[PDB]
Design a protein around this ligand. Structure first.
Ligand SMILES: CC(C)CCC[C@@H](C)[C@H]1CC[C@H]2[C@@H]3CC=C4C[C@@H](OC(=O)CCC(=O)O)CC[C@]4(C)[C@H]3CC[C@]12C
Ligand SMILES: CC(C)CCC[C@@H](C)[C@H]1CC[C@H]2[C@@H]3CC=C4C[C@@H](OC(=O)CCC(=O)O)CC[C@]4(C)[C@H]3CC[C@]12C
Ligand SMILES: CC(C)CCC[C@@H](C)[C@H]1CC[C@H]2[C@@H]3CC=C4C[C@@H](OC(=O)CCC(=O)O)CC[C@]4(C)[C@H]3CC[C@]12C
Ligand SMILES: CC(C)CCC[C@@H](C)[C@H]1CC[C@H]2[C@@H]3CC=C4C[C@@H](OC(=O)CCC(=O)O)CC[C@]4(C)[C@H]3CC[C@]12C
Ligand SMILES: CN1[C@@H]2CC[C@H]1C[C@H](OC(=O)[C@H](CO)c1ccccc1)C2
Lengths: 69, 445
């Protein structure tokens, strides 16, 4: 949004919440982190830069209100 | 970019179709041989039938779809096929461990409650046990794997992948390993440990059962004294009214002269623990009991059960020979005893028990060692194919990344190999499956 930016917030397997981005973080990320073959740790939130995508990671970035749903 | 795969996936990919066929055919044999042969219909094998049903689902659906997913690197069968594959795999795997619990407890209650538990050990109640085990396995995993995405309102599983959505957190996979594997394995190991020590007591029960008799109602013994159960003297008073009151003292219930099957076992355990405790407090019987093996300690417990601690301690030469491991020479001395001349055949059975070191004078124990070996095989085959993956998920939770990807695929795969070798254990352990499989494969039914 213009000035303000709210991302979906998720660090667990339960219902997601919403986070108001602090100044300097203008992106919403949706991040699947690889640990073991069928294991992907799923996180959603706000960030200043997109996290580094390692081997077998899938990361989606965007700058719209709640675009990482 | 070309992908250079490891030799492990080549190993998994080629042999999976071959092991899938071996799993389904071997598990169809136990299924059909159970229907063709009415003699295989023993309560022990009914549990094995439920394991084979779980092994059949793994060999038909779980094993093949795993290897397609492994070899393609993604799930191309849609979102619904993923949920069904995960459900069928986890429910069947949970039914396996739930069954292995039932088999373990069944041996435990059969040995610790020989008269009580086997009294109600019918092919009908074992069906309820198998039915409930498959029911709880379904209710735990099936509605959760299929409908968790509908509960949280979103499907967060990666689009090209296939896994349980509510285990998509590393700490949760640790807890599931502890609760679904490590907790059931520890209780099975403790049950397996207790069975080893309790079967000695089970044999003493059957030993004394034929020597001392078994009656649930008060009766006069060979000396005219009122007795109930396995040689439990109630009173030496001529009035049976004292016998009823003494029975009401040991059993906190208005017995009116009769006890139940459970109550008989409790009196036997109290009397045999008092017998072995009388052995331990005696300085003459302390060394000989410790030195002897399980079968000969049972014969010593028999004599103490019959006469008493101070009665058996008088046989100084015989005890001095049993501690000295001179069995044939000690057998002729106890024949010289007044004990030998008074009881007709109990003494001779106890004598042959010392010199032979076997139970041959009482029973054979060839059928029960066979079933115990069948138990030991299915548990050990479960441990050797499931702990690798589970010690990996353990170290994966603490160590960041030090278990290779090739080992995960092997360990995950090795759990499937358990389903392939259960029929092999059956034909190797039970010689009735072995022969019934031969007439089915050669078309001789
Ligand atoms: C009659 C058939 C159905 C039974 C045998 C089937 C499999 C058990 C065999 C067939 C081809 C064999 C494979 C042939 C070649 C190799 C490569 C070999 O690679 C190495 O030795 C070093 C590898 C490296 O350094 O990268 C490891 C064993 C393996 C996978 C073999 C494993 C066992 C396989 C899959
Ligand atoms: C379709 C997928 C999702 C699951 C397939 C599971 C089958 C392998 C299970 C489900 C119902 C089971 C059957 C349900 C009840 C019986 C009766 C039972 O009959 C007896 O043992 C009594 C003696 C006799 O009739 O011969 C034999 C096993 C059998 C056929 C079971 C065999 C294995 C079955 C077919
Ligand atoms: C398809 C998946 C999800 C469930 C598979 C369930 C089977 C593994 C369970 C459910 C019904 C159970 C059967 C239901 C009834 C019987 C008959 C029962 O036979 C007797 O009671 C002996 C006396 C008589 O034959 O009447 C022995 C257990 C058995 C085979 C049970 C064995 C295990 C079965 C097949
Ligand atoms: C179904 C039964 C009757 C026959 C199939 C037996 C297999 C399940 C056994 C037999 C040979 C075993 C394998 C022999 C050698 C190894 C190498 C061993 O070490 C390595 O893989 C090297 C480290 C690495 O490169 O990752 C890991 C286990 C494994 C695959 C063993 C896993 C279990 C195997 C495949
Ligand atoms: C889907 N898993 C099951 C069958 C193949 C994989 C590997 C095994 O995973 C487990 O051992 C875990 C516990 O660590 C488990 C999950 C559900 C039931 C029993 C065991 C069972």
């Amino acid at each position: 949004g213009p000035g303000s930016l709210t991302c979906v917030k998720s660090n667990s397997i339960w219902f997601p919440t919403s986070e108001d981005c602090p100044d300097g973080q203008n992106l919403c990320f949706k991040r699947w982190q690889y640990i073991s073959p069928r294991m992907y740790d799923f996180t959603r939130g706000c960030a200043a830069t997109c996290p580094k995508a390692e081997y077998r990671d899938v990361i989606n970035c965007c700058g719209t209100d709640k675009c990482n749903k | 970019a070309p992908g250079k795969g490891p030799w492990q996936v080549a190993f998994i990919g080629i042999t999976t179709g071959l092991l899938s066929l071996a799993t389904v055919t071997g598990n169809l044999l136990v299924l059909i041989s159970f229907k063709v042969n009415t003699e295989l219909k023993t309560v022990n094998n009914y549990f094995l039938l439920s394991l084979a049903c779980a092994d059949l689902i793994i060999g038909t659906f779980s094993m093949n779809l795993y290897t397609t997913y492994l070899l393609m690197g993604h799930w191309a069968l849609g979102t619904l096929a993923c949920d069904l594959w995960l459900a069928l795999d986890y429910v069947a795997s949970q039914a396996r461990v739930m069954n292995l619990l039932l088999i373990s407890f069944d041996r435990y209650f059969s040995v610790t409650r020989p008269l009580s538990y086997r009294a109600k050990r019918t092919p009908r109640r074992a069906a309820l046990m198998i039915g409930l085990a498959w029911l709880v396995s379904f209710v735990l995993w099936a509605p959760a794997i299929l409908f968790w995405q509908y509960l949280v309102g979103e499907r967060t599983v990666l689009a090209g992948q296939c896994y349980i959505q509510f285990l998509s957190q590393p700490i949760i996979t640790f807890g599931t390993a502890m609760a679904a594997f490590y907790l059931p394995v520890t209780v099975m190991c403790t049950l397996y440990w207790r069975i080893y020590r309790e079967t000695e007591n089970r044999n003493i029960f059957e030993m004394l059962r034929i020597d001392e008799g078994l009656r649930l109602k008060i009766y006069k013994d060979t000396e005219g004294y009122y007795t109930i159960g396995i040689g439990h003297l109630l009173t030496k008073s001529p009035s049976l009214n004292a016998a009823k009151s003494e029975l009401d003292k040991a059993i906190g219930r208005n017995t009116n002269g009769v006890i139940t099957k459970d109550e008989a076992e409790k009196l036997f355990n109290q009397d045999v623990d008092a017998a072995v405790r009388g052995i331990l407090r005696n300085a003459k019987l302390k060394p000989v009991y410790d030195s002897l093996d399980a079968v000969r300690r049972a014969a010593l417990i028999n004599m103490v059960f019959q006469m008493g601690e101070t009665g058996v301690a008088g046989f100084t030469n015989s005890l001095r020979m049993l501690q000295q491991k001179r069995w044939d020479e000690a057998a002729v001395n106890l024949a010289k005893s007044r004990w030998y001349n008074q009881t007709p055949n109990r003494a001779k059975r106890v004598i042959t028990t010392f010199r032979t070191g076997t139970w041959d004078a009482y029973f054979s124990l060839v059928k029960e060692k066979k079933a115990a070996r069948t138990l030991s095989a299915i548990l050990l085959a479960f441990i050797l194919t499931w702990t690798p993956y589970n010690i990996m998920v353990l170290v994966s939770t603490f160590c960041k990344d030090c278990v290779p990807e090739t080992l995960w695929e092997l360990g995950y795969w090795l759990c499937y190999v358990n389903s392939t070798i259960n029929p092999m254990c059956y034909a190797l352990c039970n010689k009735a499956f072995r022969d019934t499989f031969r007439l089915l494969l050669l078309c001789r039914w």
